[PDB]
Amino acid sequence: MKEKIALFGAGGKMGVRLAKNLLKSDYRVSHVEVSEVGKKRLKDELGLECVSTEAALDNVDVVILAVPDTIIGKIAAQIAPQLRPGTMVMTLDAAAPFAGHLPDRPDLTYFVAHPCHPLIFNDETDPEARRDYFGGGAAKQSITSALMQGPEEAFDLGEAVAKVIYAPILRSYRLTVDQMALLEPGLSETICATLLQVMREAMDETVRRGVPKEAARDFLLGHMNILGAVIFNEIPGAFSDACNKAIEFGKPRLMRDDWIKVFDREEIAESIRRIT
C-alpha cells in the first residue's frame, strides 16, 4: 500500500479515467463526487462507491482536483483548511494555478500534471493502442509536470502519481507552470486547434466548390501525413521547390504578421483569464 489520494470530481470525464488507472496501482484512493450521474458511472463502470469530503481527507497525502478549471479555486478554498502542511494539491491543467487561484498557503505542496496524448506519428504494434487517441488506455503518452510549490522531494511523488493516472507512459518531463502555459493554451489550443479548424474550413470549401467530400478528406489527411512527417523530422526528406514556393507566398497570404506574439506573457495570461 502506498500514499492515500483523495480524488475530487471522480465521476467526470478525467475522473473516471484516473479512477480506472488508479485501481490498477497500490495507492489507497477515496473518491468524491457531487453529481448523481457521476456517482452512477463510477458504480456501474468500476464498482466504486463515493465518500464524504471528511472521509476522503482523513490522513490524505495527495488531493487531485479533477474538477472544472473555473471552480478549482473555489473548491481548493473549501478544502484547504482540512489539509495539513506538506499535503499535495494536484491539478490536471496549468490554467487555474497560473491564474493564482490556489489558496495562500506557503506550507502546502502544489503540483500540476497534464498529458501530451499519444503522438500522431507512432508505431504502436498493438492495433488497440493504434486506436487510443486520448491516452490512458493502451497507447503510450508523454506527460508534463510542474512542482509549483513545495520541497524538491515532492516532485518525485507527484510525478509517480502522474505516471500512474496517465499510464502507459512514453516520456515524463519536468516544466515550470509558466512553461506549461506556453504549451496550453498557447501551442495546443490557440495555435494547433485554431489551425486545424482552418484546415477543416479549407477542406469544406473545396467540397462546396464541387470536390467530392471523401476525396477532399483523403487528399488533406494523406498530404498532412507526408508533409507533417517531413516538417516534424519523423522521416528524412525536404520539401520540393513547389511546396516551398507555396509556403513562401502562403505565410503572408494567410497569417497576420504578428501571429507569433500569442506567446507573449500578456497574451497567454489573457487566454487563461478567459477560461478560468
Add this chain to the structure above:
Amino acid sequence: MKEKIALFGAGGKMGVRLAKNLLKSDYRVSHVEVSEVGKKRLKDELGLECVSTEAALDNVDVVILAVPDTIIGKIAAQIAPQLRPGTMVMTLDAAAPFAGHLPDRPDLTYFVAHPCHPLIFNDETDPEARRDYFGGGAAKQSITSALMQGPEEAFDLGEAVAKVIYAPILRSYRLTVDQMALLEPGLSETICATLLQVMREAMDETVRRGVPKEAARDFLLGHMNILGAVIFNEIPGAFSDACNKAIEFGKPRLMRDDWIKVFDREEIAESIRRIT
C-alpha cells in the same frame, strides 16, 4: 501483356517509384531518361535499361511524363508529333495541364493522376505499411484522376494505369482538372503546408522560450492526434468549452479575414503560374 507505356523521366524521384510498381504488372514499359545518375539508379535498383525516345514511342498507347512541371510543356511539344491520334499523354500533377501547357492536339487523350498519400489516421496492421508515409510501397493510398480530353472510355484505361503506379490503393476518385487545382496547390500546399510550417514555428518558439525541445514536440504531436481525430471525424467527440474559446479568439488573432479567398480562381491560377 497489356498496353505499351513510355515512361519519360524514369530515373527521377517519381520515375523510379513508378518503374518499380510497373515491373509488377503486365504492362509493356519503355523507360526514357536523360541523366546518367538516373540511368544508374534504374540499372542498379531495378536492373532496367533505358531506350531512345523513338524506341519508347514506337506503337505506344500511354506516355507518362514523370518530368518536372516547368518542362512538361516543352517535352510534350517535342514528342507530340510522334504520337498518333488516341494516344494518352499522362501527367502526375495538375499544374502544367491547368496552365494550358499541353499541345494543341484535339485528337490526343490527356489524363492527370495524383496520389493522396496514406492517411495520417490509418490502422495499417502491417508495421511496414505504418512507416510508408509516401505511398506506393506498403501502405494503401487513395488517388485522384482527371480525363482532361479524350473519349469517356479512356478514363478507364488511365485509372487502371494510375492504380498500378500508385499501388496499393485505398479509394480512386474522378475529378476535373479545375478540382485537382483546388486540391493542389490550394488545399495541400497553400493551406496545409503553410499551416504546418506555422505550427512548427510555434513549437520552435516555445523551445526558444525554455520549453525542453522533446517536450514541445511530444505535446504538439499528441494534441494534433486527439484534436485532429475529433475535427476530422475519425472518432466521435466534441471540443471542450476551453478549446472552443481558444478557436473563437484564435481565428481573428492569427488569420487574415480574407484567407479563404485563396480558393478563388484567380488566386489558384497565380499559384500555378509560380510553379510552371
